[PDB]
Design a protein around this ligand. Sequence first.
Ligand SMILES: CC(=O)Nc1ccc(NC(=O)C2CC2)cc1
Ligand SMILES: CC(=O)Nc1ccc(NC(=O)C2CC2)cc1
Lengths: 471, 470
Amino acid sequence: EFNILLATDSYKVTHYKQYPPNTSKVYSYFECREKKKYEETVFYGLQYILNKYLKGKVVTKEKIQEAKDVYKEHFQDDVFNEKGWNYILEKYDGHLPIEIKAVPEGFVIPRGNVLFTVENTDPECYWLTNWIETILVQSWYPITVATNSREQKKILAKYLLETSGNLDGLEYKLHDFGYRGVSSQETAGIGASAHLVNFKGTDTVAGLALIKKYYGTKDPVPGYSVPAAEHSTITAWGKDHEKDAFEHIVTQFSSVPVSVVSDSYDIYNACEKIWGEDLRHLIVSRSTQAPLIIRPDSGNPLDTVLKVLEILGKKFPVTENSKGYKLLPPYLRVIQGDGVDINTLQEIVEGMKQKMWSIENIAFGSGGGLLQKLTRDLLNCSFKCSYVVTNGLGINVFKDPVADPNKRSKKGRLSLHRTPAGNFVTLEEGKGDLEEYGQDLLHTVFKNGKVTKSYSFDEIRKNAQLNIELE
Amino acid sequence: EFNILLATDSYKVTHYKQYPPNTSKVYSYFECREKVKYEETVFYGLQYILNKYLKGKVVTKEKIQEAKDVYKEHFQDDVFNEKGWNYILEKYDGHLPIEIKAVPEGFVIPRGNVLFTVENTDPECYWLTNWIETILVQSWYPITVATNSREQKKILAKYLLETSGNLDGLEYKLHDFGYRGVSSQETAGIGASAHLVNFKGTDTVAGLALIKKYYGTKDPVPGYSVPAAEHSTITAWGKDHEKDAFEHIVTQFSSVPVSVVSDSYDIYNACEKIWGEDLRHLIVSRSTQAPLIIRPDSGNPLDTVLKVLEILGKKFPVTENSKGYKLLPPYLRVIQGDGVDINTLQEIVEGMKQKMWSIENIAFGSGGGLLQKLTRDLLNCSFKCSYVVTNGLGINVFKDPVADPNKRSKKGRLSLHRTPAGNFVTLEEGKGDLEEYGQDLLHTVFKNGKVTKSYSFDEIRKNAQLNIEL
Ligand SMILES: CC(=O)Nc1ccc(NC(=O)C2CC2)cc1
Ligand SMILES: CC(=O)Nc1ccc(NC(=O)C2CC2)cc1
């Protein structure tokens, strides 16, 4: 069973002996720090952490004893705020005396703005604000996945609109194949749910359950998939029988869309000879609601995609759309699911555009690039103390390392506001109290062990829409 | 509650309909495919997966119904193999009819060798082998952390041995600060445990419990930490009171080691004037068992370490060790916990060596670089079918993409062997049965719902030792 007393950076266990004596309040904030591109970030994932880990009776006698026993061996010393944890158990029935205020989930906010703040609601628990830094900072992950996923959506929308004249199917153009490429089951669910803020396609089922339990959607599920082969279901037929495997699978799945990996031995032979000749009669007969989707999975991603389209365009009837771009027949599409990240995604669609291929023709799958090849440094996700009260006097605190101005932190009590031009500004030093900038956009979401404001996944999706979708 | 019917890639739900008719056996294997350079990998972490997710009754009526309802909406179609899962429920009381063979955990094996194999033990459950690919493939993560952690130990060992003449304290030279920098609580525990294969220092508490539950150590805990400041415990005193903060903290922790972040405003001032002058009397009085450990945390990592050392060298009595390298007094050390990954670690220790500073003087902390900035591509961790039986005939299967020879997979039944020179070789096409290469080095670790062979964390550590330690 999860124990919040064991869910912090070890050294934090020792911090109740380090703050200035007579400190009644520690107030800290989280930002995606500006770095001297990722100019705006989707705020998502806090509500999961609040419900799964922080809410309700999270302290018990047994949990305190367990922690005491572990830390004694871990430190080879007795340092551990047993009294402090007892106080929360006795006075608040194990509920964290903490208030967290946050921007609504789904909101898209420029770098360098306060996204949430944390403070203790009882003077005795001044040490608790930063105890829970470790667990709260892990919000960097769904924030970064949602943000990086949204940025790939911008690229797709731009090129889809240019080559086709509309955005139809945009929400299916980047599929999550990341289940096997992430570091754990829990990461898989969190990461999949963050991708679903922006798209509807995922093969990692864990994302669905998480969304239902922690956020909720009107639709039965937030995510979808279609029948698809892997290399094992082709190669199991034997090297001389790829055609047989192909024929079997497309016939099994004759009325739904079907993805078939085509590069087991020779992707170009498979497209030109097998699909394009031997089995062409099983492809051209297919419904528009059930195309064959050809899946290359090796080689230079751009070069392979172009050569695959070139091959197919000579074997199947291609049309030219109203924008001047070439379009495969509706029963035939391509998915590139190898080597895809935000950099290569851009290179592929631009390369397709150069060769006059509509983005209508293709969709993308991303695994490690989508859910694993990301770090806290990408958006400089960071949690810092900005305000303390000591001897009843509030003081604005901050770091400002001489060798790195980029690591300077904000001062005092913070608030987030709309500017007169409609942008965002973070006010420091309690200047929000002057009320010159309209309402603070941060809302209380957690207070004294209870979740006080929640968002549905439908609202979050609405908040995270692209401008191009809006327009 | 975790449901293994829902812990696969969505598309694998439809695979029982895609294999050749009358297939009775699917046999697959995992390798770190040969292409840095990461020539050898530590095999670690399968035992966690076996126990937490695969063993015992993993199928119930409720889990079957649950997955049915989920997949119906997910595919917008009824495609779930309800009958197959019911067969396992009814026949084997929900225990998986699967056999897994694996190299011992902690083993250091060159790239391109079979590390584990998977096959169904019941003909009806031919589809089961690749259903669990997704869960088993996540072993890439502990393998890669452990391997990358060990590669850094190799670097530290070389430079420590060169500058000091021994390896004393090596196991504490790379400390895990990755708890906040990983993608989840579960990942934190797994990765920390993998780091602990090589080192004893971690602030990621979750690692200890994982090891205790799934592996076990003779000692009460496998990892240790020491009291340390963060920016909030320095800055909370106010910008004009950094000295007061330093004095309070080193006085509170006067007889244990204490790490004190010193770059809140001006690292160089902090070292030269605050520590080196104002509070010097509180530092030179400390025990060898309780040093002050000064922690810079910003600026170019190499330049910052070198300047911090030059500053301290002029304020405190420096000795020259037997190898001719400079050594701070035993009550004073440094930890660099910013910008550290396998690349910069190398640059820092080489830079220290060039300036005649012993590696004894320093330790490193790494977070995202240690536990998060790694992918399945680093070691090319990959799971592939190599052998099937269809119509009673065994077939050696494989992929071999024309535009990428690096993606070619192995053929047939596999086994791992010791060569005449004492190295590892993987034999394909069932050739291990010819008995020209001695016994198979893989062991059966899982069979029909039971873990059949396991390793303590102490055994794993021993297996993973560096040659220089041996
Ligand atoms: C629009 C589209 O192409 N969707 C789509 C295509 C393929 C897959 N799935 C696969 O290709 C799996 C085998 C990897 C999922 C959605
Ligand atoms: C040998 C050594 O220097 N160990 C060591 C030093 C510092 C810390 N911990 C910290 O510096 C925490 C503040 C980040 C842990 C172990």
